[PDB]
């Protein structure tokens, strides 16, 4: 066993030297002469109200007009962000829901949580009422993040220290991803839908391969549980938020840290991370009722977006980058948008 | 400013909003209790009296509907999902007196009672359960009668100074759990002894739930 342990320790040191060799200069050093964004001030354009409990997830539709929010009330409302209309109100089987998703085609929405079951709902049906298309079972831990690839493929990351890929038609896990040692709290799907990362509680983020089924790269650097993750718009980077009150941006090709977005006056942990359309603004949802906007190339806060009473648990920028909703534990979503 | 279809879309939203309000004024009527037991200590004797992850046991007493969520099934980290329960009326903790000498099967080094104390330590002073009450339950007292005769209470606590009689041995165990309660200003942890046949367990939970309802009602009015 010691032989393997030493081979391990030796291999771990080998990759550390490889990462050190490739780090010619830090991301902050090179991006020093660029003009900073200045001061990004955002106003609450809409306040989607009607939830009766905390909010742990939201996902914008591909049209950038419909968003689905999940709450402890047991309701999964599909809002209409343009006119604040509740298109649907799906009553969940289990009120303990910690994740939600909108299918890229706009036909399905998925929810999951402490019930360890990912439920797929069919929005477009002849009967006119949303029905549970299929309940996906096979996880022995709380489900924390589910994201759709197509209308028949969904990736779920749960408390089973594993992430799984499902075939909605059959209802079984075609590919199961293993390797994490701690609870997996969030996952992000690449724009090409060929790779996806996952943020685990062991302060490690692993880049998986959906087609193959094994971890491609492992990223370390955090000091606490990684509570959120999101891909860069170009798909060659991702940002991790953790209870350490630090947001960190890694690179897939460099396979090492690039920058850390930290501040001495911030102690609460990040609950949600989402980039902008251009990949410059790093919206992050902290637990101090703020949504500090971090310049991803300067690591300087450019906004506070302080309009919430309780924690900003979930947030997401639209596909056209025209708005950034911020779900929160005070049962109110707010569609922020920077005016001219 | 609103089209014929747009006007009807708003009517759909208004109809949807009423259902949420109707289901929001009904969920608040129910009482949510988190049965956060120790490692295979209780959680089986009490649930029989009051009727793959979260399992919900729904029972009613005195025109009050209680929802009980046995979360002990999950083996994941407690901290990452326990904020979901912030807002429960009370926490029905369950400790078995019969484990005062038994050792953990998975560890064989740590006493089973000491395992319960360790979990109570973090839970009682958790950052989410400063206001929520804790209904501590001490079951399996029938077997505790015979077990204490064979072995004294010094097996778990060598600092104990007393005889093997049930009156003072059980009181020490109660006093041990009173110690770890640090927030002695906005939370009093209720204690109760139950066998496998008494039907007063539901009544004790209701009595402790009512004292939380009064505190919640006073907060709404403006006092407290």
């Amino acid at each position: 066993l010691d032989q393997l342990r030493q081979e391990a320790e030796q291999l771990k040191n080998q990759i550390r030297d490889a990462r050190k060799a490739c780090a010619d200069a830090t991301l902050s050093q090179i991006t020093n002469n660029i003009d900073p964004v200045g001061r990004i001030q955002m106003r609450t354009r809409r306040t989607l109200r009607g939830h009766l409990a905390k909010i742990y997830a939201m996902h914008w539709g591909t049209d950038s007009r419909l968003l689905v929010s999940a709450s402890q009330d047991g309701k999964l409302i599909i809002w209409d962000s343009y006119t604040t209309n509740k298109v649907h109100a799906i009553p969940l089987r289990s009120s303990w829901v910690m994740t939600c998703a909108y299918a890229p085609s706009g036909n399905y929405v998925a929810c999951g949580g402490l019930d360890n079951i990912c439920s797929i709902y069919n929005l477009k049906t002849r009967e006119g009422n949303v029905r549970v298309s299929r309940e996906l079972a096979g996880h022995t831990g709380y489900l924390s993040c589910c994201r759709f690839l197509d209308d028949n493929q969904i990736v779920t990351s749960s408390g089973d220290t594993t992430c799984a890929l499902w075939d909605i038609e059959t209802g079984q896990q075609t590919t199961t991803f293993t390797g994490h040692t701690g609870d997996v709290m969030s996952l992000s799907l690449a724009p090409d839908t060929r790779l996806f990362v996952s943020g685990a509680c062991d302060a490690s983020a692993k880049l998986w391969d959906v087609r193959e089924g094994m971890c491609r790269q492992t990223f370390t650097g955090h000091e606490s549980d990684i509570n959120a993750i999101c891909f860069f718009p170009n798909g060659n980077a991702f940002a991790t938020g953790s209870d350490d009150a630090t947001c960190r941006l890694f690179d897939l090709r460099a396979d090492q840290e690039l920058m850390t977005y930290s501040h001495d006056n911030i102690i609460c942990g990040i609950t949600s991370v989402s980039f902008s359309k251009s990949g410059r603004l790093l919206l992050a949802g902290y637990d101090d009722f703020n949504c500090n906007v971090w310049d991803a190339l300067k690591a300087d806060r450019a906004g506070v977006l302080a309009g919430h009473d309780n924690r900003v648990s979930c947030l997401g920028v639209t596909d056209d980058g025209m708005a950034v909703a911020t779900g929160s534990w005070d049962s109110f979503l707010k569609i922020w948008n920077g005016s001219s | 400013t609103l089209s014929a279809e747009d006007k009807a879309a708003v009517e759909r939203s208004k109809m949807i909003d009423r259902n949420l309000r109707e289901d929001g004024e009904k969920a608040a009527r129910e009482v949510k209790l988190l049965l956060l037991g120790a490692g295979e200590s209780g959680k089986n004797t009490i649930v029989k009296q009051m009727k793959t992850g979260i399992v919900e046991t729904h029972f009613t007493f005195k025109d009050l509907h209680f929802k009980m969520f046995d979360v002990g099934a999950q083996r994941s980290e407690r901290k990452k999902w326990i904020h979901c329960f912030e807002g429960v009326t009370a926490i029905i903790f369950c400790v078995a007196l019969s484990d005062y000498d038994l050792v953990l099967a998975e560890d064989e080094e740590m006493n089973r009672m000491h395992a319960s104390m360790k979990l109570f330590d973090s839970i009682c002073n958790n950052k989410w359960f400063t206001d929520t009450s804790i209904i501590l339950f001490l079951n399996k007292k029938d077997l505790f009668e015979e077990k204490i005769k064979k072995s004294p209470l010094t097996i778990c606590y060598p600092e104990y100074a007393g005889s093997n009689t049930y009156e003072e041995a059980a009181a020490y165990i109660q006093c041990q759990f009173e110690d770890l309660n640090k927030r002695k200003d906005t939370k009093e942890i209720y204690t109760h002894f139950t066998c496998s046949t008494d039907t007063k367990n539901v009544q004790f939970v209701f009595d402790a739930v009512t004292d939380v309802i009064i505190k919640n009602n006073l907060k709404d009015c403006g006092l407290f």
Partner: single-chain antibody, 230 residues
């Protein structure tokens, strides 16, 4: 989904009659209901409308103050009280379901049909009979009094096809989008006033009469009706 109606029959003028529309196979309480009648050897015209959770009972001008439409959600049945049945009232009445939200498909399903034998937007079609053959593309054009392009960007046009001895079927809604199950060969288009509908590969099942709806103003006036001949 299946809407079956009953209550039609011969009625003397000045009498009374009740039409019942039985809704089965879909969430009736969540669907707004319309009543549409069609005079024999003529087109369609809107009659009444009731909303889910009745709070909007808009009628047609020619029947306003004389016809009453009521829905019974618990039993899934739609009513229409016939009062002072005039000579013009003889027609075949259709039960229509509709749901209204973002991206919905109103006027989706139509009832089988029950026969009775006793300012507003204008929609006219230049042609009434187009002799066509399978394999060629034919365009059906309607007209409108004013632009139907609301400030939301939606143009409220609904197309329908009524094959002989059959209920109308939705083909194009909002002048841009197909309905459920409709062949992809249909493709609607047009501006607020410039107005047309194109069919690519005509077959033996595409014959019938094409009607165009305006839905911006609730009077809901149909079109003349372009009949396709094999």
């Amino acid at each position: 989904v299946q809407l079956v109606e009953s209550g039609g029959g011969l009625v003397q003028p000045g009498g009374s009659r009740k039409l019942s529309c039985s809704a089965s196979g879909f969430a009736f309480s969540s669907f707004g209901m319309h009543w549409v009648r069609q005079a024999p050897e003529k087109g369609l015209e809107w009659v009444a409308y009731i909303s889910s959770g009745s709070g909007t009972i808009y009628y047609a001008d020619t029947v306003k103050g004389r016809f009453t439409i009521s829905r019974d959600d618990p039993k899934n049945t739609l009513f229409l009280q016939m009062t002072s049945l005039r000579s013009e009232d003889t027609a075949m009445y259709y039960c229509v379901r509709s749901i209204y939200y973002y991206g919905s498909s109103p006027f989706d399903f139509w009832g089988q049909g029950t026969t009775l034998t006793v300012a507003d937007i204008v929609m006219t079609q230049a042609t009434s009979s187009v002799p066509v053959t399978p394999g060629e593309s034919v365009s059906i054009s309607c007209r409108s009094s004013k632009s139907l392009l609301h400030s939301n960007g939606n143009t409220y046009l609904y197309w329908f096809l009524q094959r002989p001895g059959q209920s109308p079927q939705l083909l194009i809604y909002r002048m841009s989008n197909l309905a459920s199950g409709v062949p992809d060969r249909f493709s609607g288009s047009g501006s607020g006033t410039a107005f047309t509908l194109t069919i690519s590969r005509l077959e033996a099942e595409d014959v019938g009469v094409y009607y165009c709806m305006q839905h911006l103003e609730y009077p809901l006036t149909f079109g003349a009706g372009t009949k396709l001949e094999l």
